[PDB]
Amino acid sequence: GDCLPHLKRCKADNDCCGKKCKRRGTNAEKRCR
Structure with a gap:
């Protein structure tokens, strides 16, 4: 369990x-923004 950063x-x-x-x-999966 671990979320990615906002970038x-x-x-x-x-x-x-x-x-x-x-x-x-x-919404799909490019980069945390």
């Missing part, structure tokens, strides 16, 4: 520590 690549929407991972469309 590192994320493999899932709920993978960052902000629960807001950016992507190329509507």
